[PDB]
Amino acid sequence: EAPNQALLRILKETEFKKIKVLGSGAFGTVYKGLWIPEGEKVKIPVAIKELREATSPKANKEILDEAYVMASVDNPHVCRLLGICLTSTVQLITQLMPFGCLLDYVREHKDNIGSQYLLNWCVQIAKGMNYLEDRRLVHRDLAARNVLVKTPQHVKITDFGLAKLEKEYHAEGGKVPIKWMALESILHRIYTHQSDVWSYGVTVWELMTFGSKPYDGIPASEISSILEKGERLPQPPICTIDVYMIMVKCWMIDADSRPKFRELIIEFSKMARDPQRYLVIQGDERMHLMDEEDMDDVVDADEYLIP
Numbered sequence: 001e002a003p004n005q006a007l008l009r010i011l012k013e014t015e016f017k018k019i020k021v022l023g024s025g026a027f028g029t030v031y032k033g034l035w036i037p038e039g040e041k042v043k044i045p046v047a048i049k050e051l052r053e054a055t056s057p058k059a060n061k062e063i064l065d066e067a068y069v070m071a072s073v074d075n076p077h078v079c080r081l082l083g084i085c086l087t088s089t090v091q092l093i094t095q096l097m098p099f100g101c102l103l104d105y106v107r108e109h110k111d112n113i114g115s116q117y118l119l120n121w122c123v124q125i126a127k128g129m130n131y132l133e134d135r136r137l138v139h140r141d142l143a144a145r146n147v148l149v150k151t152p153q154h155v156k157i158t159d160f161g162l163a164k165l166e167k168e169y170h171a172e173g174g175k176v177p178i179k180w181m182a183l184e185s186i187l188h189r190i191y192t193h194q195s196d197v198w199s200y201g202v203t204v205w206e207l208m209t210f211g212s213k214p215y216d217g218i219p220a221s222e223i224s225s226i227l228e229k230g231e232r233l234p235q236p237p238i239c240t241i242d243v244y245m246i247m248v249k250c251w252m253i254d255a256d257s258r259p260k261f262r263e264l265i266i267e268f269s270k271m272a273r274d275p276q277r278y279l280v281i282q283g284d285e286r287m288h289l290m291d292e293e294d295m296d297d298v299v300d301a302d303e304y305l306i307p
């Protein structure tokens with residue numbers, strides 16, 4: 001395989017002000033913050049993620065693996081990893097996705113989200129994955145919750161705490177999101193780019209139903225059996241057969257039968273030129289979608305390139 005020559009940047013703690021808390025609980029704490037690189041006269045909105053103070057070998061092992069992945073990817077639809085800070089408690093520094101994650105965004109905005117946005121997201125999510133696929137990299141945790149919103153017109157794939165790289169990954173134990181996983185994954189712990197496709201379909205279904213919970217009510221235990229019966233998730237109200245048909249394709253038992261991300265890009269992108277043919281939403285046409293006196297030298301991460 002090719003040599004992975006990505007650079008890992010180590011940041012001085014003194015190079016960045018924290019400003020507000022964003023997450024807290026599930027593993028670490030996430031902060032809104034600003035990063036003023038060395039003597040650069042730029043300021044970069046970032047998300048700082050250090051881990052729940054007290055440190056365990058078990059924890060750092062994962063944040064660094066994550067950092068390994070995030071640093072080795074460079075696409076407009078995959079999260080930008082900026083660098084790490086090696087203080088007692090290891091901090092991950094990434095691009096601030098101001099509007100939070102997509103799952104929350106859809107719930108909190110259903111009455112103003114139009115087919116144009118929905119299909120654009122679908123397209124942009126597909127491109128992220130196609131790209132990961134070129135880098136021969138398997139996400140293993142694609143879901144509405146793991147796509148972040150930099151602006152409503154620009155989403156990016158995130159969360160590489162499970163990402164892997166061989167024809168199919170053969171996992172061990174650990175806590176897994178059942179309701180998003182292909183069947184080969186549930187029964188054999190096999191993960192290919194095609195099991196990622198399956199989780200794509202579920203993600204799309206999450207978006208089309210404005211953030212429902214797949215198989216809400218059904219417990220994880222039954223799922224393998226349900227999907228074995230031939231059952232899939234229902235057709236979202238707003239969804240033309242065309243769109244839903246693409247979703248169903250994602251959820252086929254013969255994994256080679258499912259579409260390739262590069263095909264998903266094509267199909268959604270066609271649809272995205274005539275959004276209202278493919279998504280029926282009441283109100284569509286009549287719908288549309290920072291805060292410091294000190295914001296003079298602010299530059300989004302996406303314009304802050306380094307060689």
Ligand SMILES: Nc1ncnc2c1ncn2[C@@H]1O[C@H](COP(=O)(O)OP(=O)(O)NP(=O)(O)O)[C@@H](O)[C@H]1O
Pocket residue numbers: 022023024026027028030046047049094095096097098100101145146148159161
């Ligand atoms: N780079 C970022 N920019 C903006 N908001 C973020 C960023 N990273 C995380 N958040 C927010 O903080 C929440 C929780 O942090 P996060 O670490 O993403 O979730 P988690 O519960 O630890 N598990 P996972 O979904 O696997 O990351 C997310 O759902 C986002 O709303």
